Curated annotation (Swiss-Prot):
Tissue: Widely expressed (at protein level).
Record function comment: Regulator of different signaling pathways. Regulates EPHA8 receptor tyrosine kinase signaling to control cell migration and neurite retraction.
Compartmental location: Cytoplasm; Cell projection
Superkingdom as given in the UniProt entry: Eukaryota
Protein's organism: Homo sapiens (Human)
Protein name, per record: Ankyrin repeat and SAM domain-containing protein 1A
Gene: ANKS1A
Quaternary structure and partners: Interacts (via SAM domain) with EPHA2 (via SAM domain). Interacts with EPHA8; EPHA8 kinase activity-independent but stimulated by EPHA8 ubiquitination. Interacts (via SAM domain) with EPHA6 (via SAM domain).
Limits of the SAM domain: 7-73
Record's comment on post-translational modification: Phosphorylated on tyrosine residues in response to EGF and PDGF.
Amino acid sequence: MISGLRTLEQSVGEWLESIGLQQYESKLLLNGFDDVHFLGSNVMEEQDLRDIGISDPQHRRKLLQAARSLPKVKALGYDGN
């Protein structure tokens, strides 16, 4: 999703709360993955979400979309602001 309407200051809880996965926050926190400024750095692959607990499809594809949709991402084409 090249587009997205979100806040420029959201934490793990709130972030996951916007998608309804705040319940799995504990898993994303106990795995030292709470770093919101790493969602774009860390691999954040399916296996990563599975190792923490998120082994669901609607929970893996969602966390991967909201994670990659974040700023500071490897430019692939067409620069923007």
